[PDB]
Design an enzyme around this catalytic site. Structure first.
Site, mmCIF file in Angstrom:
data_model
loop_
_atom_site.group_PDB
_atom_site.id
_atom_site.type_symbol
_atom_site.label_atom_id
_atom_site.label_comp_id
_atom_site.label_asym_id
_atom_site.label_seq_id
_atom_site.Cartn_x
_atom_site.Cartn_y
_atom_site.Cartn_z
ATOM 1 N N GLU B 258 -3.394 3.132 0.336
ATOM 2 C CA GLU B 258 -4.491 2.388 0.894
ATOM 3 C C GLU B 258 -5.560 3.291 1.509
ATOM 4 O O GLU B 258 -6.533 2.827 2.151
ATOM 5 C CB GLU B 258 -3.977 1.391 1.885
ATOM 6 C CG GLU B 258 -2.760 0.705 1.430
ATOM 7 C CD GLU B 258 -2.453 -0.498 2.306
ATOM 8 O OE1 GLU B 258 -3.316 -1.378 2.373
ATOM 9 O OE2 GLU B 258 -1.390 -0.570 2.935
ATOM 10 N N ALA B 301 -3.174 3.976 9.444
ATOM 11 C CA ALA B 301 -4.519 3.491 9.198
ATOM 12 C C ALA B 301 -5.524 4.363 9.959
ATOM 13 O O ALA B 301 -5.323 4.735 11.147
ATOM 14 C CB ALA B 301 -4.627 2.007 9.596
#
Ligand SMILES: [Cl-]
Ligand SMILES: [Cl-]
Ligand SMILES: [Cl-]
Ligand SMILES: [Cl-]
Lengths: 381, 381, 381
Positions: B258, B301
């Site tokens: 991601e 993240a």
């Protein structure tokens, strides 16, 4: 044709619905199916132009009766019913609808006229849900995704478990699915003849814009950033730089979205998800609940939000607010007012302890380096 | 036709390979070429449906002999050989393959049947590598990229130097290259006639999905996020929000990706590259080596990983781990066990000093603001 | 035809320009228009193949005269003039250009030959600006965006106010606009007949590559990442992972862009916008000015830049430099040399106070956790 008046029509529905074990569907529609190029029994996608949720039960009765009329045994104790439409089914339904055929605005009836006109064998299927349980078919998965993306049902409110196991991973070319094995089998021929299809993505899910038409005030600046099953409240903007809205995720009011909303995450009205921000979806652990951000929250560029936030919260750009991050509390008396049941007795709190509170401002003290949780000054007013 | 048995075929290969200075190719295939709309000698792209790496040397011998048979002088001391195929070359090769023509599963032979059937002049070219050196042609650059993306060779294992200088920057419309000067020359005509082609991107490299068919358990949710030359191990997922896999980069086992994997960066099996995370590719300096992340690493993240990591390392969301970042070491005794040659004598280490170690957990102390390197508790077990 | 020599042509221009209240346009061109599928008076897009800025005033005079010649009343005191071209207008203009018709390189004249050849009613419109004020039409908004993206005018130099209110939010399918209401009205028919158009995005603005041809050394690796109205200096690269260039934003020299440039933000030559970095556009407040980053600035991966930076500034990966962030100053004497008017009297400065300074290095002290502003060692040399 024996159904000559709308009164005849209503008595017919009464007779159908009094059949033994009959259940009114909670959701239904008719899908056009895309099948495997090699495996023609593999359903690669389903498309609906009309979704019925807790409505138009008479229309559902006529469709179910078309099948029963030709001997199809419907198990009304199953959670769902899926069946391929034959021309006879369409003609049967249109004849029951005779009293309405010269009138406008009967959408299910209009759809049948269209399907009759464009009929092909094995192309169209009736799909209905009798209860909200795990999907048993590609068709019912697609009906569920539509229920979410059309906003007939709220985010998180329906059962999608097992969806990944039922869906086939396929190539997608101008939003049309192609079996990977078909590409492998035909690669030499297609590449040498210069007919290799343009593959936009390889996945089990399609994009939102292949299926849903936004409201006039809703913008999605790049289709790959909104998965099918996303739910965007009217007035939302999805910017293309570093955003994402996954399935069973989205917004419950108009929001500016420039970051990533994971599955199960819900963002409330008036919130602003800054460029490259991350909103995680599900809290850690076995009874780990879904993450919600409330109304008018401001999530800074390149922030990470790993806990539920109440209304009027601010996460500064660059800050990661994770379940285990510790924060030094400031403004306890004012925060108590916005959050009367919370016990602001101590000085250091973990992210997870602060979940769901209103008026929080997560920031870093740039002199001491401490992570702070303080009052959003705007939240008092 | 004089090659009547498979024994005749093998003697023919022996005769060819005993020619003076003959070298067996290390890699070969046949490409369909896309040429300039204005400059027809400019090769804008090459597409292969079959890549041979250290295999099928008999088939390569037949192809090389087709050229030699008509007087083409092959320099077997050059690193590569590229030549346009004529129909006569295809017919010559198919005649040498006579003993196999009624059999199934000979892929190079099947390809020739297809090319003969779809033959056009200057459309197809034989491309082979005799050694691994800098590419001298667009065609050999494309063979090298294919060797990487098909995983015939490992990431970083082949010479790609100079590729950027050889490739033309072109417009790409539904994965077809168009010379920019062609668009300029035809802009008035095309726009006023409403025939302006849809330009998806302008670059020197194509996308992975224009060339490679993923495994059935590999997903790429948006083509623009995987450049041609990327290498994705079976089972990898590339999410579309803020990810990227550049050429000569990727995964060596199934990973959830991601975030952004720069050229030369390799991510090991079971790792999770979080939303908007950055993995840099090459360490700073003149002998600056490539960055590798080991197995089962968790990159948060919006993190940045600027050093090689061993197995079971964790970078918390939002953390930047750069070569010059200083970290306060915790858990020295347990980290010593996972890393027996490393000297954990001191308290502060620069990122670069910690490169390649196992079981590291990079985090920020949220009370003091200190950057910490500690034990990943899961890495002991 | 009465205009037989170039001298006749110049006297004609003199007569036109001496008409009462005549003003030379500052910008002009001819657009092909895309109209609503339902509302044919709604202009959904305008495309130009030639933009004239402060040039070719004779050509503008001939076009304006074509309209005046048939009784169109031009208000030369309005900021702009837009009018649909009829065939007679094109023929009139081509007759005035008679002395040039057998010559090459007269681009406005070539365009008219093309439009005559491809003429359709209501398809083409003359668009001109007499002054730089708020746009009053879709057509003039598009001329303004073109002036920016073709770099005829500098970033921020023209009035775009009100653009959002004039533009229609539409679906875009292979860069062609479709009214959302058209999709709604035709959804059943299109989906059931399997003719639903592929919708790439829903927005009021098109993409840059639908309109502009980059220089041969300019690359845009994904069209959705550059909005129409962006301005990219020759030699710029836009990578696809997490980048964006919005309208009235971009680069003034060759830059590597891997992050997000907001509207009004300008990045100077030789700068490097790292992967997932954010550059905000406009400073907070009522007289909040636009953000500019100077030459040779290095913005780290996942950083945020919320203030104007001078030349040779560095923002480390992961750092957020916001207007209200406080920084501890280091290297005051050397920074004074690069910034002779600034008063480096104190120790702590807010981001906003440091705006526009040269040679700044924003970093975090990884032991104390303090945010620092220091000297970029390379900026002295
Ligand atoms: Cl405490
Ligand atoms: Cl030390
Ligand atoms: Cl990002
Ligand atoms: Cl001070």
């Amino acid at each position: 044709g024996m159904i000559n008046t709308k009164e005849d029509f209503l008595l017919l529905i009464k007779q159908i619905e009094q059949k033994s074990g009959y259940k009114k569907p909670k959701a239904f529609g008719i899908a056009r199916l895309d099948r495997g190029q090699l495996n023609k029994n593999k359903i690669l996608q389903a498309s609906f132009a009309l979704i019925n949720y807790e409505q138009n039960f008479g229309s559902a009765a006529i469709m179910l009766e078309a099948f029963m009329q030709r001997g199809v045994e419907i198990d009304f104790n199953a959670s769902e019913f899926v069946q391929t439409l034959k021309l006879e089914d369409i003609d049967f339904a249109l004849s029951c609808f005779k009293p309405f055929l010269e009138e406008d605005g009967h959408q299910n009836i209009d759809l049948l006229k269209i399907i009759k006109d464009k009929f092909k064998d094995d192309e169209f299927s009736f799909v209905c849900l009798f209860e909200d349980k795990e999907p048993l078919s590609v068709e019912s998965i697609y009906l569920k995704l539509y229920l979410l993306s059309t906003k007939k049902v709220p985010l998180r409110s329906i059962n999608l478990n097992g969806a990944f196991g039922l869906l086939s991973n396929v190539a997608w070319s101008d939003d049309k699915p192609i079996e990977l094995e078909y590409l492998r089998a035909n690669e030499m021929r297609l590449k040498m003849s210069n007919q290799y299809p343009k593959i936009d993505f390889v996945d089990k899910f399609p994009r939102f814009l292949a299926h849903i038409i936004p409201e006039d005030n809703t913008r999605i600046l790049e289709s790959s950033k909104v998965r099918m099953g996303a739910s965007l409240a009217a007035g939302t903007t999805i910017m293309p730089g570093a955003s994402y809205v996954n399935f069973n995720a989205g917004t419950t009011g108009a929001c500016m979205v420039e970051g990533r909303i994971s599955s199960s995450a819900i963002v409330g009205e008036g919130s602003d998800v800054g460029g490259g921000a991350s909103i995680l979806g599900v809290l850690s652990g076995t009874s780990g609940n879904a993450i919600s951000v409330g109304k008018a929250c401001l999530l800074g560029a390149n922030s990470v939000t790993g806990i539920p936030l109440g209304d009027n919260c601010i996460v500064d750009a660059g800050i990661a607010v994770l379940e285990g991050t510790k924060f030094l509390l400031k403004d306890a008396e004012e925060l108590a007012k916005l959050n009367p049941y919370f016990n602001f007795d101590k000085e250091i709190y973990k992210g997870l302890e602060l979940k769901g509170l209103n008026g929080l401002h997560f920031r870093q003290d740039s002199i001491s380096g401490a992570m702070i949780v303080a009052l959003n000054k705007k939240a008092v007013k």
